[PDB]
Amino acid sequence: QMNYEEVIKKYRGEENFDHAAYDWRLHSGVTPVKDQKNCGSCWAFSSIGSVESQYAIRKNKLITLSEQELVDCSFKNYGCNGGLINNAFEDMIELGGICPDGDYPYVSDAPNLCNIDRCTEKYGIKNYLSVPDNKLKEALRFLGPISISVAVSDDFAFYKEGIFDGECGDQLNHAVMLVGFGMKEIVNPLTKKGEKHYYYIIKNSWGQQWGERGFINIETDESGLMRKCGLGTDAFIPLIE
């Protein structure tokens, strides 16, 4: 139902933008890294994070929201055994939004019953938009952090710093957040000249001792059409206004 071209017209206009670099971490767009722990709940962490970002960006409100409520209460998804990003946003509309996680804490795979009335005020969305796979940089620049799929392998678990150089998973398997893009000039030791190396910046939900304080840089190109490991094959952004 929501049309990307109609939405982008509204938020971008005719405003042009640098394709090299834009990081929401520096423009009040990214809330703290969380940890899903031993629980297949990344679908909830990715989608909640993107809502958290929109409140920071559009309402100047820092709020941390309850992945646990989505885990317990989202009937379209399967809790600790997996789910879908779009399904998560659908359930948030149906549920009337989500409690702050201060009122509804994360207990991982511990048994827990859905209770949709744990707070005085829930934080909702109006709808969500699918981002076309060739518009990730524009969508990031003008709309905000995006909930995306990626195909992760065990190489991801050993990532420490820099631009990811490991193998891809066999299949899209993990929901994360696209929070920006960047570029680093590195001298080619043969040509002795600087070369531009572009990357997407992703927020994961494996805690802050993983990767670059919870984040990972993934190789892209200037246009952003380069999508390593199927990144952004599913790409959804919630809208709260």
């Binding site: 031993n38 990715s46 055994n81 991801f156 420490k160 001792q209």
Partner: protein, 107 residues
Amino acid sequence: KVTKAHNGATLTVAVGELVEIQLPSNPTTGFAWYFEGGTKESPNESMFTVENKYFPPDSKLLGAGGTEHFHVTVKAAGTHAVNLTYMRPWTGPSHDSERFTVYLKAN
């Protein structure tokens, strides 16, 4: 052959026989099964060799876990502890890590 149901069992096996260990495993959480040190390789290649493989689920959900297969072949006579821990490799194990052990007894 071997599953979580066999945790702590002793299996009688021949030198040269392949034991397939199949364990649930979700790489989307960062956890996987490891020998001590955070490796998929055998503690002692003279006693037994280990090959390893992840198999994703037929589910297309994000966060749906799969299965690790460890193919263990005993190389010398003796009773050999195969000790695995389910852990994040950057964190290492704790008191409460899930552990799997099987003993492989070859005459």
